[PDB]
Amino acid sequence: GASKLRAVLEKLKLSRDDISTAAGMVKGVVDHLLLRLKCDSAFRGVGLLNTGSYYEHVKISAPNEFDVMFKLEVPRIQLEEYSNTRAYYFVKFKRENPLSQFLEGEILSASKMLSKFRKIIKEEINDIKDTDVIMKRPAVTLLISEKISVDITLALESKSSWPASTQEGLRIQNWLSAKVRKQLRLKPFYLVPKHAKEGNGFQEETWRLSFSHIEKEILNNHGKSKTCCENKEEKCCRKDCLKLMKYLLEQLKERFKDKKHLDKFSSYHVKTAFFHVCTQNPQDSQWDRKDLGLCFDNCVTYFLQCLRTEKLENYFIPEFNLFSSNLIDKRSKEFLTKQIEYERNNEFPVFDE
Numbered sequence: 372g373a374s375k376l377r378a379v380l381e382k383l384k385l386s387r388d389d390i391s392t393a394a395g396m397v398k399g400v401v402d403h404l405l406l407r408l409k410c411d412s413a414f415r416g417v418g419l420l421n422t423g424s425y426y427e428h429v430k431i432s433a434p435n436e437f438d439v440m441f442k443l444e445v446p447r448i449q450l451e452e453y454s455n456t457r458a459y460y461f462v463k464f465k466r467e468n469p470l471s472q473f474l475e476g477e478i479l480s481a482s483k484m485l486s487k488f489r490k491i492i493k494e495e496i497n498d499i500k501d502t503d504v505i506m507k508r509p510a511v512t513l514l515i516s517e518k519i520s521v522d523i524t525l526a527l528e529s530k531s532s533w534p535a536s537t538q539e540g541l542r543i544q545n546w547l548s549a550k551v552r553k554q555l556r557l558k559p560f561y562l563v564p565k566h567a568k569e570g571n572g573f574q575e576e577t578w579r580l581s582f583s584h585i586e587k588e589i590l591n592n593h594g595k596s597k598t599c600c601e602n603k604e605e606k607c608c609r610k611d612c613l614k615l616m617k618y619l620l621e622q623l624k625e626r627f628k629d630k631k632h633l634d635k636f637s638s639y640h641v642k643t644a645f646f647h648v649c650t651q652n653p654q655d656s657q658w659d660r661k662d663l664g665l666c667f668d669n670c671v672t673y674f675l676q677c678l679r680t681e682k683l684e685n686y687f688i689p690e691f692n693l694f695s696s697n698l699i700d701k702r703s704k705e706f707l708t709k710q711i712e713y714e715r716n717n718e719f720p721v722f723d724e
């Protein structure tokens with residue numbers, strides 16, 4: 372039961388120094404790219420966005436896979452929703468500025484910005500032989516010494532009120548309080564470019580709303596009680612359940628690598644499902660450390676439901692379905708449904724030693 376799960380968590384602790392070292396490699400490469408981008412007139416305002424809950428500038432999204440976000444302070448943004456998608460928007464500037472070279476009419480071109488961003492980085496990773504860095508295809512994906520991959524996301528920062536599509540999102544009122552929800556909604560939001568001809572290209576220059584910076588505000592301040600996990604009397608298992616969900620997905624993706632059925636699923640999906648379960652189970656007494664196995668089952672059952680019903684709401688944008696057929700094909704969701712069901716009904720053989 373829970374003892375198999377606690378053993379998994381104890382084993383995860385053994386790779387803490389591998390992780391810390393890789394995160395240091397990433398940090399060096401990114402600092403170097405940061406000062407070069409700052410030379411460019413378009414990217415003079417670039418900086419690192421703190422999104423990690425463990426390491427500040429670097430978020431780990433899988434073993435030796437790391438995520439980094441470069442933000443661009445961008446004033447006076449005017450948004451126009453693209454074809455009722457709730458998450459994708461055209462970016463204009465309320466009535467010159469450094470980004471003027473990327474305009475196509477009033478509209479800021481995602482693909483032109485991405486193109487110069489990529490070009491500057493690809494040119495720059497050529498030029499330090501202290502580490503070996505190439506570029507794969509997240510604006511850019513790097514590979515460091517053929518082992519550690521870094522996804523680098525460029526994002527516009529907007530200090531305006533959040534778009535109306537988020538009005539019913541971040542549904543934390545009954546768990547973390549309406550006061551906290553108000554404070555978090557005073558923070559900036561971010562727009563990440565979607566190339567006009569990439570993916571199944573819209574043929575438009577649209578940007579997706581991004582709230583990845585909110586994760587650390589909540590994951591490390593996660594209780595109904597303000598002192599949850601700050602003393603020995605208030606120990607919950609929220610963080611451990613999330614770790615186990617991520618590890619479940621990681622291990623399944625590894626086992627199904629022969630035909631890569633699970634390529635489209637990521638830790639973002641797991642995290643989104645996990646925080647929906649936090650909304651559903653707002654009391655700290657529902658996450659008692661002694662109940663690790665039941666709490667994990669709660670999390671897996673909800674993820675399974677999302678898979679079977681092909682529905683996983685964006686935590687911030689309820690009308691945006693992360694599991695829509697536009698984003699993940701039906702056979703992928705049907706396939707993972709079957710595997711998650713098997714693991715849950717058989718006490719997670721994927722965690723066996």
Ligand SMILES: Cc1ccc(-c2cc(C(=O)O)c3c(c2)ncn3CCc2ccccc2)c(Cl)c1
Binds near residue numbers: 579581642646
């Ligand atoms: C309580 C809470 C707080 C934050 C998050 C959160 C948000 C985002 C986001 O909206 O950017 C995340 C993320 C985690 N992990 C990865 N991304 C990035 C997604 C993304 C964005 C744009 C294009 C493609 C993909 C969650 Cl689920 C819950």
Ligand SMILES: [Zn+2]
Binds near residue numbers: 599600
């Ligand atoms: Zn806690």
